mmCIF file of all heavy atoms in Angstrom:
data_model
loop_
_atom_site.group_PDB
_atom_site.id
_atom_site.type_symbol
_atom_site.label_atom_id
_atom_site.label_comp_id
_atom_site.label_asym_id
_atom_site.label_seq_id
_atom_site.Cartn_x
_atom_site.Cartn_y
_atom_site.Cartn_z
ATOM 1 N N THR A 516 -10.777 -7.438 -1.339
ATOM 2 C CA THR A 516 -12.097 -7.031 -1.888
ATOM 3 C C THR A 516 -11.873 -5.963 -2.964
ATOM 4 O O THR A 516 -11.209 -4.952 -2.649
ATOM 5 C CB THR A 516 -13.031 -6.482 -0.802
ATOM 6 O OG1 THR A 516 -12.458 -5.291 -0.255
ATOM 7 C CG2 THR A 516 -13.297 -7.464 0.318
ATOM 8 N N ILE A 517 -12.406 -6.176 -4.174
ATOM 9 C CA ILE A 517 -12.339 -5.228 -5.331
ATOM 10 C C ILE A 517 -12.640 -3.792 -4.871
ATOM 11 O O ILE A 517 -12.039 -2.858 -5.441
ATOM 12 C CB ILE A 517 -13.277 -5.666 -6.479
ATOM 13 C CG1 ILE A 517 -14.714 -5.919 -6.007
ATOM 14 C CG2 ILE A 517 -12.709 -6.873 -7.208
ATOM 15 C CD1 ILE A 517 -15.716 -6.080 -7.130
ATOM 16 N N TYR A 518 -13.533 -3.625 -3.886
ATOM 17 C CA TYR A 518 -13.969 -2.315 -3.332
ATOM 18 C C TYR A 518 -12.869 -1.739 -2.436
ATOM 19 O O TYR A 518 -12.444 -0.592 -2.681
ATOM 20 C CB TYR A 518 -15.295 -2.463 -2.581
ATOM 21 C CG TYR A 518 -16.428 -2.963 -3.439
ATOM 22 C CD1 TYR A 518 -16.777 -4.304 -3.455
ATOM 23 C CD2 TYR A 518 -17.136 -2.101 -4.264
ATOM 24 C CE1 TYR A 518 -17.809 -4.773 -4.255
ATOM 25 C CE2 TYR A 518 -18.171 -2.552 -5.069
ATOM 26 C CZ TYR A 518 -18.510 -3.894 -5.064
ATOM 27 O OH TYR A 518 -19.528 -4.347 -5.853
ATOM 28 N N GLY A 519 -12.426 -2.512 -1.437
ATOM 29 C CA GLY A 519 -11.355 -2.134 -0.493
ATOM 30 C C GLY A 519 -10.065 -1.753 -1.203
ATOM 31 O O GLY A 519 -9.406 -0.789 -0.759
ATOM 32 N N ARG A 520 -9.722 -2.474 -2.275
ATOM 33 C CA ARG A 520 -8.493 -2.243 -3.078
ATOM 34 C C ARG A 520 -8.643 -0.968 -3.915
ATOM 35 O O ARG A 520 -7.667 -0.196 -3.967
ATOM 36 C CB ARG A 520 -8.182 -3.466 -3.945
ATOM 37 C CG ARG A 520 -7.634 -4.639 -3.146
ATOM 38 C CD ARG A 520 -7.722 -5.958 -3.886
ATOM 39 N NE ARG A 520 -7.022 -7.024 -3.176
ATOM 40 C CZ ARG A 520 -6.786 -8.245 -3.656
ATOM 41 N NH1 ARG A 520 -7.183 -8.586 -4.874
ATOM 42 N NH2 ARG A 520 -6.141 -9.127 -2.910
ATOM 43 N N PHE A 521 -9.801 -0.751 -4.549
ATOM 44 C CA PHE A 521 -10.080 0.468 -5.355
ATOM 45 C C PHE A 521 -10.051 1.704 -4.440
ATOM 46 O O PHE A 521 -9.625 2.776 -4.914
ATOM 47 C CB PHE A 521 -11.399 0.359 -6.127
ATOM 48 C CG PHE A 521 -11.626 1.488 -7.102
ATOM 49 C CD1 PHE A 521 -11.182 1.396 -8.415
ATOM 50 C CD2 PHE A 521 -12.252 2.661 -6.700
ATOM 51 C CE1 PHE A 521 -11.369 2.450 -9.299
ATOM 52 C CE2 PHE A 521 -12.444 3.710 -7.588
ATOM 53 C CZ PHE A 521 -12.003 3.603 -8.888
ATOM 54 N N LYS A 522 -10.479 1.560 -3.177
ATOM 55 C CA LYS A 522 -10.449 2.640 -2.151
ATOM 56 C C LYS A 522 -8.996 3.000 -1.814
ATOM 57 O O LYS A 522 -8.716 4.206 -1.673
ATOM 58 C CB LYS A 522 -11.200 2.231 -0.881
ATOM 59 C CG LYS A 522 -12.717 2.325 -0.981
ATOM 60 C CD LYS A 522 -13.426 1.859 0.269
ATOM 61 C CE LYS A 522 -14.929 1.809 0.103
ATOM 62 N NZ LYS A 522 -15.604 1.410 1.360
ATOM 63 N N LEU A 523 -8.121 1.996 -1.678
ATOM 64 C CA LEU A 523 -6.672 2.186 -1.396
ATOM 65 C C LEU A 523 -6.058 3.068 -2.491
ATOM 66 O O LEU A 523 -5.460 4.098 -2.138
ATOM 67 C CB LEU A 523 -5.988 0.820 -1.309
ATOM 68 C CG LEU A 523 -4.509 0.836 -0.923
ATOM 69 C CD1 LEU A 523 -4.094 -0.503 -0.329
ATOM 70 C CD2 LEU A 523 -3.618 1.194 -2.112
ATOM 71 N N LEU A 524 -6.218 2.681 -3.763
ATOM 72 C CA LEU A 524 -5.703 3.424 -4.952
ATOM 73 C C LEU A 524 -6.082 4.906 -4.837
ATOM 74 O O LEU A 524 -5.176 5.753 -4.978
ATOM 75 C CB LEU A 524 -6.279 2.812 -6.237
ATOM 76 C CG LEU A 524 -5.653 3.288 -7.551
ATOM 77 C CD1 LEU A 524 -5.914 2.281 -8.661
ATOM 78 C CD2 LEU A 524 -6.155 4.673 -7.960
ATOM 79 N N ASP A 525 -7.366 5.195 -4.586
ATOM 80 C CA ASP A 525 -7.938 6.569 -4.517
ATOM 81 C C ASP A 525 -7.154 7.419 -3.506
ATOM 82 O O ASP A 525 -6.981 8.623 -3.783
ATOM 83 C CB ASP A 525 -9.435 6.547 -4.174
ATOM 84 C CG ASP A 525 -10.342 6.041 -5.287
ATOM 85 O OD1 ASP A 525 -9.818 5.487 -6.275
ATOM 86 O OD2 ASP A 525 -11.571 6.207 -5.154
ATOM 87 N N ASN A 526 -6.694 6.826 -2.395
ATOM 88 C CA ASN A 526 -5.890 7.516 -1.346
ATOM 89 C C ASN A 526 -4.549 7.984 -1.923
ATOM 90 O O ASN A 526 -4.117 9.102 -1.572
ATOM 91 C CB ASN A 526 -5.640 6.639 -0.114
ATOM 92 C CG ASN A 526 -6.865 6.478 0.759
ATOM 93 O OD1 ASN A 526 -7.975 6.310 0.262
ATOM 94 N ND2 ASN A 526 -6.669 6.537 2.066
ATOM 95 N N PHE A 527 -3.923 7.164 -2.772
ATOM 96 C CA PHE A 527 -2.586 7.412 -3.374
ATOM 97 C C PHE A 527 -2.725 7.918 -4.821
ATOM 98 O O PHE A 527 -1.688 8.000 -5.502
ATOM 99 C CB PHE A 527 -1.743 6.135 -3.307
ATOM 100 C CG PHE A 527 -1.381 5.677 -1.916
ATOM 101 C CD1 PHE A 527 -2.330 5.102 -1.088
ATOM 102 C CD2 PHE A 527 -0.083 5.799 -1.442
ATOM 103 C CE1 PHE A 527 -1.992 4.673 0.187
ATOM 104 C CE2 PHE A 527 0.252 5.371 -0.164
ATOM 105 C CZ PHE A 527 -0.704 4.806 0.648
ATOM 106 N N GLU A 528 -3.939 8.281 -5.265
ATOM 107 C CA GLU A 528 -4.237 8.757 -6.650
ATOM 108 C C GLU A 528 -3.452 10.044 -6.940
ATOM 109 O O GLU A 528 -2.976 10.193 -8.086
ATOM 110 C CB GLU A 528 -5.741 8.979 -6.834
ATOM 111 C CG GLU A 528 -6.138 9.437 -8.232
ATOM 112 C CD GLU A 528 -7.624 9.686 -8.440
ATOM 113 O OE1 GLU A 528 -8.440 9.053 -7.737
ATOM 114 O OE2 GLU A 528 -7.965 10.517 -9.307
ATOM 115 N N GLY A 529 -3.347 10.941 -5.954
ATOM 116 C CA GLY A 529 -2.518 12.163 -6.014
ATOM 117 C C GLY A 529 -1.069 11.912 -5.614
ATOM 118 O O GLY A 529 -0.244 12.824 -5.825
ATOM 119 N N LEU A 530 -0.768 10.729 -5.061
ATOM 120 C CA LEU A 530 0.561 10.327 -4.517
ATOM 121 C C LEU A 530 1.223 9.273 -5.421
ATOM 122 O O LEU A 530 1.983 8.431 -4.897
ATOM 123 C CB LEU A 530 0.340 9.786 -3.098
ATOM 124 C CG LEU A 530 1.587 9.552 -2.245
ATOM 125 C CD1 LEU A 530 2.469 10.783 -2.212
ATOM 126 C CD2 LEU A 530 1.210 9.132 -0.836
ATOM 127 N N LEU A 531 0.958 9.307 -6.731
ATOM 128 C CA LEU A 531 1.667 8.465 -7.733
ATOM 129 C C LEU A 531 2.949 9.204 -8.138
ATOM 130 O O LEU A 531 2.835 10.360 -8.596
ATOM 131 C CB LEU A 531 0.767 8.201 -8.949
ATOM 132 C CG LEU A 531 -0.647 7.694 -8.658
ATOM 133 C CD1 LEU A 531 -1.436 7.555 -9.950
ATOM 134 C CD2 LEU A 531 -0.632 6.374 -7.903
ATOM 135 N N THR A 532 4.113 8.561 -7.983
ATOM 136 C CA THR A 532 5.461 9.171 -8.158
ATOM 137 C C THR A 532 5.920 9.003 -9.616
ATOM 138 O O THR A 532 7.096 8.644 -9.837
ATOM 139 C CB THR A 532 6.448 8.626 -7.111
ATOM 140 O OG1 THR A 532 7.597 9.472 -7.144
ATOM 141 C CG2 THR A 532 6.856 7.182 -7.321
ATOM 142 N N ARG A 533 5.030 9.301 -10.571
ATOM 143 C CA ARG A 533 5.290 9.269 -12.038
ATOM 144 C C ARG A 533 5.570 7.802 -12.411
ATOM 145 O O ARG A 533 4.749 6.960 -12.051
ATOM 146 C CB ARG A 533 6.277 10.406 -12.340
ATOM 147 C CG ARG A 533 6.172 10.989 -13.744
ATOM 148 C CD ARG A 533 7.280 11.989 -14.038
ATOM 149 N NE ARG A 533 8.609 11.383 -14.102
ATOM 150 C CZ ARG A 533 9.207 10.901 -15.197
ATOM 151 N NH1 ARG A 533 8.614 10.930 -16.380
ATOM 152 N NH2 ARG A 533 10.419 10.375 -15.095
ATOM 153 N N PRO A 534 6.668 7.388 -13.102
ATOM 154 C CA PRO A 534 6.717 6.044 -13.690
ATOM 155 C C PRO A 534 7.036 4.863 -12.753
ATOM 156 O O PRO A 534 6.670 3.759 -13.113
ATOM 157 C CB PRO A 534 7.851 6.179 -14.714
ATOM 158 C CG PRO A 534 8.821 7.104 -14.033
ATOM 159 C CD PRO A 534 7.929 8.113 -13.341
ATOM 160 N N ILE A 535 7.708 5.091 -11.615
ATOM 161 C CA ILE A 535 8.174 4.001 -10.696
ATOM 162 C C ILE A 535 6.962 3.341 -10.023
ATOM 163 O O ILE A 535 6.961 2.096 -9.918
ATOM 164 C CB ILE A 535 9.225 4.509 -9.682
ATOM 165 C CG1 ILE A 535 10.560 4.782 -10.391
ATOM 166 C CG2 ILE A 535 9.361 3.544 -8.502
ATOM 167 C CD1 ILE A 535 11.796 4.759 -9.513
ATOM 168 N N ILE A 536 5.977 4.131 -9.581
ATOM 169 C CA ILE A 536 4.681 3.615 -9.044
ATOM 170 C C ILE A 536 3.865 3.026 -10.208
ATOM 171 O O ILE A 536 3.230 1.979 -9.991
ATOM 172 C CB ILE A 536 3.925 4.695 -8.231
ATOM 173 C CG1 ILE A 536 4.223 4.551 -6.732
ATOM 174 C CG2 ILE A 536 2.426 4.691 -8.513
ATOM 175 C CD1 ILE A 536 3.478 5.507 -5.821
ATOM 176 N N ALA A 537 3.893 3.661 -11.388
ATOM 177 C CA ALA A 537 3.139 3.252 -12.601
ATOM 178 C C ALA A 537 3.530 1.833 -13.040
ATOM 179 O O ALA A 537 2.640 1.112 -13.526
ATOM 180 C CB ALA A 537 3.350 4.246 -13.721
ATOM 181 N N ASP A 538 4.804 1.452 -12.880
ATOM 182 C CA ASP A 538 5.330 0.094 -13.198
ATOM 183 C C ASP A 538 4.685 -0.947 -12.270
ATOM 184 O O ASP A 538 4.399 -2.060 -12.754
ATOM 185 C CB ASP A 538 6.858 0.042 -13.095
ATOM 186 C CG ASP A 538 7.595 0.834 -14.165
ATOM 187 O OD1 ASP A 538 6.923 1.456 -15.015
ATOM 188 O OD2 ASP A 538 8.842 0.824 -14.140
ATOM 189 N N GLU A 539 4.479 -0.600 -10.996
ATOM 190 C CA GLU A 539 3.770 -1.448 -9.994
ATOM 191 C C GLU A 539 2.274 -1.512 -10.347
ATOM 192 O O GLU A 539 1.714 -2.627 -10.282
ATOM 193 C CB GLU A 539 4.029 -0.923 -8.577
ATOM 194 C CG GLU A 539 3.162 -1.552 -7.494
ATOM 195 C CD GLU A 539 3.137 -3.071 -7.475
ATOM 196 O OE1 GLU A 539 4.206 -3.682 -7.676
ATOM 197 O OE2 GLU A 539 2.046 -3.638 -7.265
#
């Protein structure tokens, strides 16, 4: 679900490890 997936991102929004997560 576009909503459920956008909610997941928000949890890891502060937990992006610079470029290695950015490539995913």
Side-chain angles (χ1 to χ4, degrees):
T516 63
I517 52 168
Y518 300 97
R520 286 162 172 189
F521 188 90
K522 282 178 186 183
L523 184 157
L524 191 159
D525 289 12
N526 286 41
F527 294 73
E528 181 181 333
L530 191 52
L531 310 177
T532 193
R533 208 187 67 91
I535 288 203
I536 264 183
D538 291 0
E539 170 51 40

